[PDB]
Amino acid sequence: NRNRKLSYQEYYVDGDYEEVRKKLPEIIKQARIKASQVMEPTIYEKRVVMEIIKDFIRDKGRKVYGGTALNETIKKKNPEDAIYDSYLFSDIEFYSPTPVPDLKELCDILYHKGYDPVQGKEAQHEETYSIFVNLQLYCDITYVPTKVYHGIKTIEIDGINYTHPHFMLIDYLRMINQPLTAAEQRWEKAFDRMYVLLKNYPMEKYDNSMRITSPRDDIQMYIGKVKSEFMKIPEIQESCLISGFDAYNFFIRHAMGDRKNFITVLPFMELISVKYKDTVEKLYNFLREKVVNPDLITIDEYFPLFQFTGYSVSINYDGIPIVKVYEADGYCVPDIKTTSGYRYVSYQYILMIMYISKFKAHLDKNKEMYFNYGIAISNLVQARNSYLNQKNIGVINDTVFSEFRIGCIGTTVSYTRMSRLRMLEKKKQGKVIQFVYTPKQYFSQTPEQQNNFDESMKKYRFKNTSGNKITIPKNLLFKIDERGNISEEISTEEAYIT
Amino acid sequence: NRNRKLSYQEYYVDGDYEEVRKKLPEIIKQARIKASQVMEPTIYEKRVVMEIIKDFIRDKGRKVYGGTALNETIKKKNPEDAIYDSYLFSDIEFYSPTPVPDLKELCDILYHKGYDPVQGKEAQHEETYSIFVNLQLYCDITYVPTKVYHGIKTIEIDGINYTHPHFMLIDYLRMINQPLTAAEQRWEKAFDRMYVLLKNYPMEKYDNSMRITSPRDDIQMYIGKVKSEFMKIPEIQESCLISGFDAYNFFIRHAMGDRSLKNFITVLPFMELISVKYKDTVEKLYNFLREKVVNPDLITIDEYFPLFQFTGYSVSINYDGIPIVKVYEADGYCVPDIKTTSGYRYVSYQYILMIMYISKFKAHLDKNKEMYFNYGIAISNLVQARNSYLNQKNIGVINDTVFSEFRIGCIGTTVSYTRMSRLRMLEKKKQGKVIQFVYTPKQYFSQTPEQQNNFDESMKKYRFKNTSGNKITIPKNLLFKIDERGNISEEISTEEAY
């Protein structure tokens, strides 16, 4: 008894959905291609500005990363595997040890060539700067500390240095290894990019065996006590993840199952902590009461390395490392909880760690460790392949070898929340919210006003992500008194370079 | 130089890609669910703030639109067709005739309830305001002129007024009808939403015949000269599109093919055009009619303000108080067209479908019962003619005929949403205008009673653009000037809208 008189028509029937879904991606591509030809700035205008930027990159030997680098390295291997149509405009992202001087020089070149408006601005990502020509984004310039910068491996195509795919793979693994913050917006795209990257640039196979020097007998026993006793403390199990070679041996052991030459001697323990200061204090104290001579215990602190690691420590006995701790506060780290109670990092996490550790050994010119990490990567891929084959399972499964794991330990916050809180901190500190360089404004000024700007540019310092040992006491996160006791420095100042 | 000869291993085999692709959507959902339980603000905190907003919407009778409205109206019809699960967070969007007073009242309620930080901010799209509680977006408040607002049809669910799906359909058609600017970011999602909308709220079937009064014999001949002569001028063919009932008769004619009923053909009450060179067209058309008419002193122009987000400025060129032709402003849009062998253009099928919807809504606001039923019948006839045509031709919804959907061919100069938005910001900056209006209750209640009352008065001195769709009665607001000699010129005037 609602309303009987109503008649309706069927606009879409069953089968129409599938037809549109299949046809839409190509229609959308054609609409994008057409738009590029008739809308200001046109593809013809875009190409001319892009060639100027490319000339600067070529001249300076700057290292291109992101989509453009992945598209070019893939196209070199197989043109049918490209991510860009190369009619459909994309901005160029490049690394630089001097991003603000580069930003000015490139903005000046475009200004003197008759382009207006031309502006270089600070991007959303701090330490990244963007160039806009006629309100259109053309390139991103990212700071890389000099030492790290020269160590980035590239493939030269048409005179341009493109970041090696296996360096770029670290960034896709970083997204996969942040399940609570990156899954929603990055995982589908990260998998797509990783898949085509590895298809064209596959995992290497190494035949060699690892050459790790067995530590001094006392060191070996101290290492053993970190795993057998320190990793038993409930507060430690809930805030720490076993990483490095001990996590690597765990994955090898699971692949053997006993039904062996891949297993390595442990040079030192390596942990990742989400309560960094708390862990370092408790670990230093633990070693102080297990060791023969407590006065022979030292701590070496290291600055973060690029975008790859946080602050770290090396707790040494008689100048020999026992254990290394890495800061992960603010991240929810992917874990594997064992029946023993202790946690290991996930498979994709240890894979990323081996990649970062191999890159660090390459920066340190440590030939022995560079080849050892390379072999560990090869062995980890092999152990995983053998395991999935043996158990007849997919890449996503219910074992320790599963990919796209969401289980993690540690408090975290969304990228959006963190970004808004960072803006509030900048606003409170009376600091510049967004830096802007306009060559029109610059060259209209008097030579005194121009020199006042050129000095201001030189007084800017970036965070210290060199990975170097901390030598300035005011930059150290931990204090060791004359009685050898650990305390956190409450009045620690942010360290800058250069 | 020289690529090395190395050994490689497998990482992804056939068909690991497919396995990941299928499993990822659910893994991502679980990562999002977990994140909402452990990350600040939690789903529990979000639900409490959302209930306060919903209480305000319910008390004020505000009309909800977008995703929330579509999800709720669909669920009412069939719960298995939900566009998203209501466990997870989604922001709410609602229409208002007083969006700034509503924004203040709702921000004040949340402030007095103990929430901090609380801010109401101007959104990226002008006339829309956003509420942020603890750095999280909760709702969007969009301005709708009073007369238009009361005319929006709703479905009441749990005390909340949700915009009728067939009003919301106009907005999805708007996206489809902007191929060069909306294809990339909106078309796939717009199709998905339209499909589920029409499945649950189908196109109606009307049996009735249209009752359009045949114009006076002279008007009929004048109407004919607009089509037979005016539409043949090459600059007119390249800047105008035939719309209204003449474009409707074109689609009916194609459906029947002259050898989809013959009784579907209507008498033309007046010509209706859409121009991408609006002022140029109106001037030329007024001049054309001045020539062809007996007694040019009987020619008048009635101007109309834009209607909501649906139409631009319009004119009605009348003879002896009788309309001959109506012109609609579309400058800045690339309008989807059908170019005939004759040279003149019609709007596309999905374009005329949207026009009939807008025209029916306008007739509803004007309380023009005759035209309201006429446009309703034209919609029913247009869906029927298309269905009959595709059925006989045995073709998909995307085809090479005049009845094809997702057409990319269009006429007129356009620019990206991003470029337009940046140019608008520059204009606001030059004019010394507020770039982004922000209301912070904390700051307000901390201010003196004079400062607080200075703000309350500012909130009354603010004028939105006149999008009432009313006839312009103030001479200073008219876009076209008619002198004592009856000649047309474009009016200068910078500011005023009522």
Contact A24, B188 (CB under 8 A): yes
**CB spacing of A32 vs B202 below 8 angstroms:** no
Q: Are B56 and B108 in contact (CB under 8 A)?
A: no
Q: Does residue B380 contact residue B204 with C-beta atoms inside 8 Å?
A: yes
Question: For residue A478, how many other CB atoms are within 10 A of its CB?
Answer: 18
Nearest chain A CA: its distance from B331 CA (Å): 14
The whole-angstrom separation of Cα A376 and Cα A262 is 8
Cα–Cα distance measured from residue B307 to residue A337, given in angstroms and rounded to the nearest whole number? 61
Residue of A nearest to B422 (CA): A135
Q: Write out the two tokens for A273.
A: 């902590």
A32–B contact, CB cutoff 8 A: yes
Interface-testing mutation among A23, A28, A191, with chain B (most B C-beta atoms within 10 A)? A28
Partners of B135 on chain A (C-beta within 8 Å) are 416-417, 420-421
CB A38 within 8 A of CB B409: no
User: Nearest 5°: phi and psi at A193?
Assistant: -65, -45
Stated in angstroms to one decimal place, the resolution of this structure is: 2.2
Q: Using the structure block, give the residue that is written with the tokens 């009242």.
A: B105
Apex CA B385: angle with CA B382 and CA B389, to 5°?
140
How far is Cα A46 from Cα A42, in angstroms, rounded to an integer?
6
Tell me which residues of chain B, numbers 237 to 296, contact chain A at a CB-CB cutoff of 8 Å.
Answer: none
Q: Cα dist. A444→A441, B117, B193 in Å?
A: 5, 42, 53
User: Does B89 lie at the interface with A, CB-CB under 8 angstroms?
Assistant: no
Chain discontinuities in chain B, listed by preceding residue (C to N exceeding 2.5 Å):
259
Cα angle at B380 between B379 and B381, to 5 degrees?
90
| Partner residue opposite B35 with nearest CB, options A21, A23, A180 | A180
Closest by Cα among B475, B411, B72, B468 to B273: B411
Q: Which residues, 6 or more positions from A425, have their beta carbon under 8 angstroms from its beta carbon?
A: none
Residues 6+ apart with CB under 8 A from B123: B129, B130, B140
Q: Count CB-CB contacts under 10 A for residue A266.
A: 21
Query: How far away is chain A from the Cα of B19, in angstroms, using its nearest Cα?
Result: 7
| Chain A nearest C-alpha distance from B1 (Å) | 10
Nearest 5°: the CA angle A475, A478, A482 is: 110
> A23 CB contacts (<8 Å, ≥6 apart)?
B396, B398, B406
d(CA A463, CA A148): 14
Rounded CA gap, A271 and A231, in Å?
A: 10
* Helix ranges (DSSP H) in A152-257: 165-176, 179-200, 217-228, 234-237, 244-256
Contacts of B440 (CB under 8 A, 6+ apart): B107, B117, B118, B119, B120
Q: Which residues of A touch B276 (CB under 8 A)?
A: none
Range 295-354 of B in CB contact (< 8 A) with A: 334
Facing A420 at nearest CB: one of B135, B334, B383: B135
Q: What does the alpha-carbon distance between residue B123 and residue B140 come to, in Å, rounded to a whole number?
A: 8
Helices and strands: H and E segment counts in chain A: 16, 21
A474 min Cα distance to partner chain B (Å): 33
b/e for A10-44, b at 16 or more Cβ within 10 A? Answer: ebbeeebbeebeeebeebbeebbebbbeebebebe
Give the phi and the psi of residue B120 in degrees, each rounded to 5. -105, 125
d(CA A134, CA B105): 41
What is the C-alpha separation between B30 and B28, in angstroms, rounded? 5
Q: SS3 for B261?
A: coil
Measured between CB atoms, does A30 come within 8 Å of chain B?
A: yes
What's the rounded Cα separation, in Å, for the pair B358 and B350? Answer: 13
Is A136 in contact with B398 (Cβ distance < 8 A)?
no
Q: Taking CB atoms and an 8 Å cutoff, what residues of chain B touch A164?
A: none
Q: What is the DSSP letter of B88?
A: S
Nearest Cα to B165, choosing from B78, B252, B58?
Answer: B78
Map tokens 């341009």 to a residue: A160
Q: Is A418 on the interface with B (CB under 8 A)?
A: no
- Distance, in angstroms, between A364 CA and closest chain B CA? 24
B33 touches chain A (CB under 8 A): no
Which residue of chain B has the CA closest to A389? Answer: B13
C-alpha dist (Å) from residue B244 to A23, B355, B359: 30, 7, 9
Asked whether A395 and A388 are in contact (CB, 8 A), the reply is yes
Q: Do residues A78 and A34 lie in contact, with contact meaning Cβ atoms separated by under 8 Å?
A: no
Cα distance between residue B135 and residue A321, in whole Å: 44
Nearest-CA distance A156 → chain B (Å): 10
**CB distance B316 to B223 below 8 Å:** no
Pick from A53, A75, A71: nearest CA to A62? A53
The minimal CB distance from A195 to the residues B17, B181, B408 is found for: B17
Which residues in chain A (148-187) have CB-CB distances under 8 A to chain B?
179-181, 183-184, 187
Q: Please name the member of A6, A21, A39 whose beta carbon is closest to the beta carbon of B204.
A: A6
Length of chain B: 498
Helix (H) or strand (E) holding A380: helix A367-391
Structure token digits, residue B126: 């002008």
Contacts of residue A27 in chain B, CB cutoff 8 Å? 183, 187, 398, 406, 408
Tokens of A247: 């996590």
B358 near B170, Cβ under 8 Å? yes
Substitution target in A20, A34, A427 with the highest count of B β-carbons within 10 Å is: A20
C-alpha atoms less than 13 angstroms from C-alpha of B235 in its C-beta half-sphere: 8
Cα separation, A114 vs A134, whole angstroms: 11
Comparing C-alpha atoms, which of A113, A130, A131, A117 is closest to residue A48?
A113
Interface contact A443, partner B, CB < 8 A: no
Q: State whether B380 and A34 contact (CB < 8 Å).
A: no
Closest CA to B416 of A46, A490, A165: A46
* Residue B182 burial class via C-beta count within 10 angstroms: exposed 0-12, middle 13-18, buried 19 and up: middle
Neighbouring C-alpha atoms within 13 Å toward the C-beta of B85: 7
| Contacts for B297 with CB less than 8 Å, ≥ 6 apart | B486
The two three-digit tokens of residue B118, written as one number = 């609380």
Distances (CA, A) of A82 to A51, A279, B95, B399: 20, 46, 44, 29
Task: List the single best residue of A77, A199, A380, A406 to mutate versus B (max B Cβ within 10 A).
Answer: A406
Residues 129-148 of chain A whose Cβ lies under 8 A from any Cβ of chain B: 135-136
Cβ within 8 Å of residue A363, ≥6 positions away: A147, A148, A151, A467
Torsion sign, CA atoms A104, A107, A111, A116: negative
Question: CA–CA distance from B54 to each of B47, B60, B64, B68, B139 (Å)?
Answer: 10, 10, 10, 12, 10
Task: Map tokens 């709410």 to a residue.
Answer: B92
What is the count of residue pairs from A and B with beta carbons less than 8 Å apart?
Answer: 175
Report CB contact under 8 Å: B396, A12. Answer: no
Min Cα distance A148 → chain B (Å) is: 23
Helix (H) or strand (E) holding B54: helix B43-60
Q: Locate the chain B residue with the closest alpha carbon to A13.
A: B199
Dihedral over Cα of A471, A475, A477, A479: its sign: positive
- In order of A324, A462, B423, the CA distances from A440 in angstroms are 51, 26, 18
Residues of A in contact with B30 (CB under 8 A): 406
Per the CB < 8 A criterion, the answer to whether B92 and B162 are in contact is no
- Quote the DSSP letter at residue A492: P
User: Cα A461 to the chain's mean position, in Å?
Assistant: 21
Residue located via tokens 């420095």:
A489
Q: Does residue B435 sit at the A interface (CB-CB below 8 Å)? A: no
**Residue A358 contacts residue A173 (beta carbons within 8 Å):** no
Distance CA A266, CA A270 (A): 10
Contact B204/A at CB under 8 A: yes
Establish how many alpha carbons lie within 13 A of residue A311's alpha carbon, considering only the half-sphere containing its beta carbon: 20
**Pick from B418, B419, B423: which is nearest to B185 by CA?**
B418
Using CB atoms within 10 Å of the CB of residue A307, give its burial: 0 to 12 exposed, 13 to 18 middle, 19+ buried. middle
- Assess contact for A323 and A330: CB atoms under 8 A: no
Instruction: Answer whether A175's CB lies under 8 Å from A182's CB.
Output: yes
Q: Which of B184, B384, B423 sits opposite A135 (nearest CB)?
A: B423
Q: Residues in chain A, how many?
A: 498
C-alpha dist (Å) from residue A256 to A108, A250, A388, A393:
61, 10, 12, 16
Burial letters B349-368, b for 16+ CB under 10 A, else e: bbbbbbbbbbbbbbbbbeee
CB proximity B40 to A under 8 Å: yes
CA distances B157 to B68, B70, B92, B152, B387, Å, are 12, 12, 15, 16, 33
Task: Give the angle A486-A490-A494 at the CA atoms, nearest 5°.
Answer: 110
> Which residues of A are less than 8 Å from B183 in CB distance?
27-28, 31-32, 35
Q: What does the alpha-carbon distance between residue A466 and residue B141 come to, in Å, rounded to a whole number?
A: 47
Integer Cα distance of A340 and B122 in angstroms: 54
Q: Helices (DSSP H) in A392-438: which residue ranges? A: 415-428
- Kind and range of the H or E element at B157? strand B154-157
Report yes or no: A490 at the B interface, CB cutoff 8 Å.
no
How far is the alpha carbon of A192 from chain B, nearest alpha carbon, in Å? 9
